[PDB]
Write a protein that binds this ligand. Structure first.
Ligand SMILES: CC(=O)N[C@H]1[C@H]([C@H](O)[C@H](O)CO)O[C@@](O[C@H]2[C@@H](O)[C@@H](CO)O[C@@H](O[C@H]3[C@H](O)[C@@H](O)[C@@H](O)O[C@@H]3CO)[C@@H]2O)(C(=O)O)C[C@@H]1O
Ligand SMILES: CC(=O)N[C@H]1[C@H]([C@H](O)[C@H](O)CO)O[C@@](O[C@H]2[C@@H](O)[C@@H](CO)O[C@@H](O[C@H]3[C@H](O)[C@@H](O)[C@@H](O)O[C@@H]3CO)[C@@H]2O)(C(=O)O)C[C@@H]1O
Lengths: 246, 200, 226, 21, 246, 226, 21, 21, 21, 21
């Protein structure tokens, strides 16, 4: 009612010569917010021998206060490719590992799994056994050394493997006929596939997972979790910054 | 003669307010005229009258004054004319300038006052938009400054961008009396934002 | 024939935001196509074309009773890190950044029964003084009048007023780009009702959409919860 | 979105990433 | 009066067949004088654990005799992008650090700030904790190793972040309603943003800040500070040089 | 398929003036526009289109009294690291370099009261001999005459005379490119005044602008204060 | 001003630095 | 089949591999 | 005289060396 | 004879080897 200002008048609000543009919104571009490296996870290695476990690239669980945590929670359905950096930190005296040969293998959404030592390198007694799937072949293997290695890390790009045209970050259903608990918001292969780190370290070190999700596609906006306690009435939420009264 | 502070004044309306904008007709931002001080025979060089515009003296613009009172921000230039009064028997000169974010002021901020610059400054004061008042030549310095500052407009209650220096170059040499300085500020292209409430 | 090269000083350093990508190790993957509706492109779109519901003492509405006068009914420090925003979309989206910019639209939906009527002065008070405390105090400022019983819902635009080309998504001890003012709804009259023993009060929901000129910048990582 | 170098296409559009229908 | 020479004549000066050009002034080009690396500052690191402090890129204070000190003092308002080099020097016996993994993170004009250990890498007991914001993500992280690292330095470019269309290197005003001391020539976010260096060194080392300011834009010339004592009357100021009586 | 490369000997060295830039880690930042007046491009411009005020015994002027003759009134070793320059812009700007080049313009503004008059011989004396000590000595050289009471201000150009394609911004124990000569103002007559009990002396300000052919080169870092 | 290589544009004008309006 | 770079032809088609008739 | 590569102009003719009038 | 790269001419035909008349 009445609209454009100055007259005390009922529905009549005042004028607003709305703003110009700068930045063209671009930072809030879902594809851009997601194409960078995130420190998601931290895990330890496996000994070259034993009958070890594969690890799963599932950045959909969350709960850890991390920005990329939420954001993936912001949408119902997601699709993007993957990109890694694995860094391996030291947890003892760095002079313990002279070699430090690390085997890594990537497993695509839905690959077979049981592995036991099965490859045997020998030479001058002693002789090493690497893992049955640590080996090089079909799924990409990546071997790197950490011995003065100016950056104890390795890295690469890996495609959207799932058999699902998109991934439901939420699922009002079960992924199995047996409607068991655990099988709730599940639906199998709703992730990026898996990896196996294995080495004569394993002890002496932890890892550093890092994902970069290029080509981000987000479908169906969802409620965006608060992330901070509710401040008191009629007040602000004061925080420490690059600004502030010095 | 008319000297411009970096550029003629723009009547453009603030790049940073979707908020409603009152422009000030001259008849509101009228003209104001006060006495700076009496340049005396003793005040050795390096002295000066700081006139940071407009504050301290803002209570006295009694009309322009009034609208900037009940309004959050303003963008405006300044037609300003410093007028020393002296005979042809006096000697000496000053240099009066408009300075961008001038500061030293021993935090007597936005209060006009008096100081003695460090020297490298009076020597290089002239590196700013300034004019010479030479007692054997003229008796008037005239400048016009435009809105200026980090923000596309500011709060005159917290920040004064323009500030006139009235520097003593050659001491006042001549008849025993003093030479009264004076100045007429009158706001150019005034523009306000956000009316504040009622003083109760 | 070998190229002549110098190893730039940082050479073996990592850096987590490289504008470039890593080497592929599983090529030739063609992906299945997706019809799946509502793929959003940019976060500002849902924030603009979407109303969130405010936060006051825990509920998303404010009350009018058959007794009120000039006591301000709704008040908020215009800052994203303000209270009555805490629950909302816009506010929470902005946590993902450093600087915000623009006006915000408020939607008040009076929800008292049709037998009922009332009026309010929604006003915006510029960040100077020390905050008004009565209608007759705010009235001198930007405000409009809402007679519930003309529109049962009304929109009000909290403008962007600042030397600040951008503003602070993460506010704190009052700075010059920390606050843009105060939103206040006051009670113009009180609750008139067909029968005051049934309808004695009214609940006006209050929602927040993002402003058309609204924008966000400089993505940031999360500090310690607080 | 965020891929900005020139060498970003050092590898093919086919090899590098994934491809829709 | 009279001008062009030879006649004793009053206002009459002599002739001057002014010079040619060479160098086209170009060195005094503000954009060029500023696009190089300056050793501005020197700071120490922070332990991977504790509840540390961010550092501020504010090259506007000055006082230190350094050329780039003045020059930034030469103008009222400034704008340029930033560029860094961080070098980390050793302050003990270089054989103490076998690993020397250093985490750095850059914070844009106006970012949140409280950080405590929050990321935990584990593997073979011991286990490391890095900082809550040292992590990789939104603001750029840079991790480098100093272990034989042929150049113990790292480096990168960072944009003009401030919310101020330009930065007042001088401010006749306050940045807060509370006209307190400290809040004088202040006005928040009148700088480049901040950084956090953190590592298992911290002790064992200092840092080496270096800025390069490309795209320099300087508005309103200001008095240029002297930099040397005032010499005696009618004399020169003799100095040591690449010339001089040998 | 890997390229064949040889690691040039300096490979992991730093070098602080690389003609090239570092790797970006925060792209897509669009900056707000700036109207803000007086953006200078090159430092020689303000130095040319701007007068600085000289330095003599602490003040920026020299005096004439009702008693003077041939005693030279103003004298300076033409060198940037000269005394009477110490305070000024031009001089201080040049500290930022190694070599200067060209003429400099001097502006003398007589500021004695209008009841007053006087004259001077401003002269420039070439860097050979052992410096003149009386007007009748300098007169044989480049100079003009200033009758204050024709112009109350006058300009005088100290030329560039040297086998030196460039000159020394950092002078010292007298070398061939260390000095270009001597500026001297002498008193042609003395102070005539309507009434000598009021006006007995006069103050001529003396300012220095940069020469049109003036230029600077080879940026340098600051040595120990002295 | 002082950027003189060829590889100076290895990265984009958009990614590398900042951009005015 | 699986050779996808640009530098894959850094070496000649003649030198690199084998050649049929 | 003796500069013979292709990359010899990796840097500009302006930046690399000196320039006569 | 056996020179087969592309970078084989990284250096000039004049600088690299020898030249007949
Ligand atoms: C995938 C697989 O087959 N794994 C088997 C490994 C691999 O074949 C082996 O590591 C290839 O390098 O081999 C295993 O069996 C080997 C083991 O029994 C050793 C111990 O004597 O002998 C190996 O054969 C010897 C043979 O005895 C010699 O005559 C000579 O030919 O050399 C070979 C090997 O160099 C067996 O292949 C193993 O022990 O791990 C079985 C794994 O399942
Ligand atoms: C941002 C954040 O959440 N920080 C918290 C860290 C990180 O979640 C953690 O470093 C991720 O690697 O974790 C903190 O809490 C962990 C701590 O209590 C340890 C000690 O027992 O347990 C961790 O969970 C274990 C769990 O007990 C096991 O069952 C199994 O699942 O492994 C996990 C971890 O590998 C807690 O998450 C921490 O101690 O720092 C709390 C930080 O705020």
């Amino acid at each position: 009612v009445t609209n454009v200002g100055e007259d005390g008048e009922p529905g009549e609000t005042e004028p607003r010569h709305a703003l110009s543009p700068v930045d063209m919104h671009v930072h809030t571009d879902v594809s851009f917010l997601l194409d960078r490296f995130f420190d998601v996870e931290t895990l330890e290695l496996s000994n070259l021998t034993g009958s070890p476990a594969t690890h799963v690239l599932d950045p959909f669980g969350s709960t850890a206060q991390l920005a990329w945590a939420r954001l993936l929670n912001t949408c119902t359905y997601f699709f993007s490719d993957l990109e890694l950096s694995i860094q391996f930190k030291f947890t003892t005296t760095p002079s313990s590992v002279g070699e430090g040969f690390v085997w890594v293998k990537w497993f695509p959404v839905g690959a077979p799994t049981k592995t036991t030592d099965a490859w045997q390198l020998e030479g001058g007694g002693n002789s090493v056994r690497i893992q049955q799937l640590a080996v090089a072949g079909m799924s990409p293997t990546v071997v790197f050394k950490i011995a003065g290695s100016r950056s104890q890390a390795c890295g690469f790009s890996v495609p959207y493997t799932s058999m699902w045209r998109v991934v439901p970050v939420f699922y009002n259903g079960w992924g199995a006929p047996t409607k068991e608990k655990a099988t709730y918001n599940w639906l199998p292969g709703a992730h990026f596939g898996s990896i196996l780190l294995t080495s004569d370290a394993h002890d002496k070190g932890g890892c550093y997972l890092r994902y970069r999700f290029p080509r981000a596609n987000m479908y169906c906006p969802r409620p965006i979790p608060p992330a901070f306690t509710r401040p008191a009435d009629k007040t602000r939420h004061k925080f420490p910054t690059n600004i502030n009264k010095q | 003669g008319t000297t411009y502070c970096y550029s003629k004044p723009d009547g453009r309306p603030p790049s940073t307010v979707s908020d409603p904008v009152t422009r000030l007709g001259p008849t509101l931002s009228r003209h104001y005229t006060f006495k700076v001080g009496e340049w005396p025979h003793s005040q050795s060089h390096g002295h000066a009258w700081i006139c940071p515009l407009p504050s301290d003296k803002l209570k006295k613009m009694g009309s322009f004054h009034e609208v900037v009172k009940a309004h959050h921000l303003v963008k405006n230039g300044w037609d300003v004319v410093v007028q020393v009064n002296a005979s042809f028997a006096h000697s000496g000169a000053l240099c009066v300038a408009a300075v961008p974010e001038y500061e030293h002021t021993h935090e007597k901020a936005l209060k006009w006052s008096e100081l003695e610059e460090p020297a490298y400054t009076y020597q290089q004061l002239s590196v700013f938009p300034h004019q010479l008042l030479n007692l054997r030549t003229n008796s008037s310095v005239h400048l016009v400054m435009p809105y200026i500052g980090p923000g596309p407009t500011t709060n005159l209650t917290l920040h004064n961008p323009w500030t006139i220096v009235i520097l003593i170059l050659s001491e006042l040499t001549g008849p025993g009396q003093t030479v009264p300085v004076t100045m007429s500020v009158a706001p150019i292209d005034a523009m306000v934002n956000g009316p504040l409430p009622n003083p109760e | 024939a070998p190229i002549r090269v110098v190893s730039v000083p940082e050479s073996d350093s990592f850096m987590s935001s490289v504008p470039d990508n890593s080497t592929p190790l599983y090529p030739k993957v063609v992906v299945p196509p997706r019809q799946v509706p509502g793929r959003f492109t940019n976060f500002i779109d849902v924030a603009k074309q979407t109303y969130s519901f405010c936060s006051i003492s825990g509920k998303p509405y404010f009350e009018v009773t058959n007794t009120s006068g000039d006591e301000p009914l709704f008040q908020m420090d215009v800052s994203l890190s303000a209270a009555e925003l805490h629950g909302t979309y816009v506010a929470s989206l902005s946590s993902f950044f450093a600087q915000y910019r623009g006006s915000l639209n408020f939607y008040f939906i009076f929800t008292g029964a049709a037998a009922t009527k009332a009026k309010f002065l929604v006003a915006f008070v510029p960040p100077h003084s020390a905050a008004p405390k009565t209608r007759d105090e705010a009235m001198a400022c930007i405000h409009a009048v809402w007679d519930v019983g003309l529109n049962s819902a009304f929109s009000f635009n909290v403008p962007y007023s600042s030397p600040a080309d951008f503003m602070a998504v993460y506010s704190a001890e009052a700075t010059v780009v920390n606050v843009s003012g105060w939103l206040q709804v006051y009670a113009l009259t009180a609750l008139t009702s067909t029968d005051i023993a049934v309808n004695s009060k009214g609940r006006v929901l209050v929602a927040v959409s993002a402003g058309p000129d609204f924008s966000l910048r400089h993505p940031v990582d999360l500090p310690d919860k607080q | 979105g965020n891929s900005g170098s020139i060498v970003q296409n050092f590898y093919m559009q086919q090899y590098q990433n994934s491809i829709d229908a």
